[PDB]
């Protein structure tokens, strides 16, 4: 098992599957939630994109480095008409500064 | 259902498994939910805790630590009280 | 006042998430067998004289150290630990908390949780690790009260 958050723009999806599952299978799971197809979706780990045939483990996801409490981020970008859009992620809110009481 | 939607106070959309969101006793009371009081940096953590909690119920495995940064602790406390979890 | 103090101590103990109740020695041993040195938990003591026991991982293996509750106070088993070198506590969590901190003598580190604690509690733990002054926190009165109920860092 491996736990991850799939992110595009302001959207973020929490799910999981086998470390041995394929990037296409993950794309197919996105189709069950967001209703777009696998061939019109491009995934990514940080900056580098992913291959449909490789396992999530082969992509470097491992149970060790993508656990429930700290699930790994997976980039996502849609097929803009006759091309693909630039993978973009809206950052999360910024926390306040700590009060002096909490050192 | 299979999934549900949670929208932070600053608009971020978070989608989680149906039974994961049932961790929050407040959420169990009601496919989409808006949170005007809870920002995205806090609500993202609340989704992580759901993964954690469900994963480590009746656990043959050792339950690991759920790290919380001091900066979010105060807001996460208020949220976690809000959500009953 | 013996009861009042015991009841409270047990109320706190239930809040920890590492009080395993009627766990056995062989159950504690199998649980802690491969866990990290210093991993600990508390369970009921089978012995007539003792109320609770600390079951902890050591380089040797999982072992047990008992807790006396006599005359309204807790302390570690004075047979194994030198009585002259023993502090006393009105709370068994306070006792454990005190020893967790000191070794940053008895090596306790992280508790082995029976089940995932609440997020509210998990925050309470983080918050308490930063500060003692609860009164001076940007929080409503009910949340401040929650933090009062369990002051500890573990």
The CATH number of residue A96's host domain is 3.10.20.90
How far is Cα B30 from Cα B12, in angstroms, rounded to an integer?
Answer: 20
Q: Which residues of chain C make contact with B77, given a CB cutoff of 8 A?
A: 120, 123-124, 127, 139, 143, 146
The domain over range C1-114 is classified in CATH as 3.30.505.10: yes
Residues 6+ apart with CB under 8 A from B16: A14, B3, B4, B6, B47, B50
Elucidation method: X-ray
The full set of domains in chain B, from first to last, is 1-85 (3.30.710.10)
Q: In Å, how far is B16's CA from the nearest CA of chain A?
A: 5
- DSSP β-bridge partners for residue A49: A44
Residue C64 near residue C55 (C-beta atoms within 8 A): yes
Tell me the structure's resolution in angstroms, rounded to a single decimal: 2.9
Domain C115-150, CATH class in plain words: mainly alpha
Residue C13 near residue C5 (C-beta atoms within 8 A): no
Residue C9, both tokens? 């101590």
Among C131, C135, C144, the residue to mutate for chain A (most A Cβ within 10 A): C131
Range of the domain at A58: 1-103
State whether residue C137 is helix, strand or coil: coil
State whether residue A64 is helix, strand or coil: helix
Residue C122 contacts B where some CB pair is shorter than 8 Å: yes
Residues 6+ apart with CB under 8 A from C103: C38, C109
State whether residue B50 is helix, strand or coil: helix
Residue C137 contacts A where some CB pair is shorter than 8 Å: yes
The domain tally of chain A equals 1
State the distance between the two ends of chain C, measured CA to CA, in whole angstroms.
Answer: 26
- DSSP β-bridge partners for residue A42: A77
């Amino acid at each position: 098992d491996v736990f991850l958050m799939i992110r595009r723009h302001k959207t973020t999806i929490f799910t999981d599957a086998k470390e041995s599952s394929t990037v296409f299978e993950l794309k197919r799971i996105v189709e069950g939630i967001l209703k777009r197809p696998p061939d019109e979706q491009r995934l990514y780990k940080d900056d580098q994109l992913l291959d449909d045939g490789k396992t999530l483990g082969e992509c470097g996801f491992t149970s060790q480095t993508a656990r429930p409490q700290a699930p790994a981020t997976v980039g996502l970008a849609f097929r803009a008409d006759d091309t693909f859009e630039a993978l973009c992620i809206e950052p999360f809110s910024s926390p306040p500064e700590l009060p002096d009481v909490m050192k | 259902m299979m999934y549900v939607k949670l929208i932070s106070s600053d608009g971020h959309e978070f989608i989680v498994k149906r039974e994961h969101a049932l961790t929050s006793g407040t959420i169990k009371a009601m496919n989409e939910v808006n949170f005007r009081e809870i920002p995205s940096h806090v609500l993202s953590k609340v989704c992580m805790y759901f993964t954690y909690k469900v994963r480590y119920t009746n656990s043959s495995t050792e339950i690991p630590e759920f790290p919380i940064a001091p900066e979010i602790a105060l807001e996460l406390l208020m949220a976690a009280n809000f959500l009953d979890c | 006042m013996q009861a009042a103090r015991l009841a409270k101590a047990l109320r706190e103990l239930g809040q920890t998430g590492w009080y395993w109740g009627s766990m056995t020695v062989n159950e504690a041993k199998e649980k802690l067998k491969e866990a990290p040195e210093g991993t600990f938990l508390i369970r009921d003591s089978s012995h007539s004289d003792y109320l609770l026991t600390i079951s902890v991982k050591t380089s040797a293996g999982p072992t047990n150290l008992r807790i006396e509750y006599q005359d309204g106070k807790f302390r570690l088993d004075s047979i194994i630990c030198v009585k002259s070198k023993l502090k006393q506590f009105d709370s068994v969590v306070h006792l454990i908390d005190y020893y967790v901190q000191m070794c940053k003598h008895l090596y306790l580190t992280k508790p082995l949780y029976t089940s995932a604690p609440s997020l509210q509690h998990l925050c309470r733990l983080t918050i308490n690790k930063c500060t003692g002054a609860i009164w001076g926190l940007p929080l409503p009165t009910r949340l401040k009260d929650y933090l009062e109920e369990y002051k500890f860092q573990v």
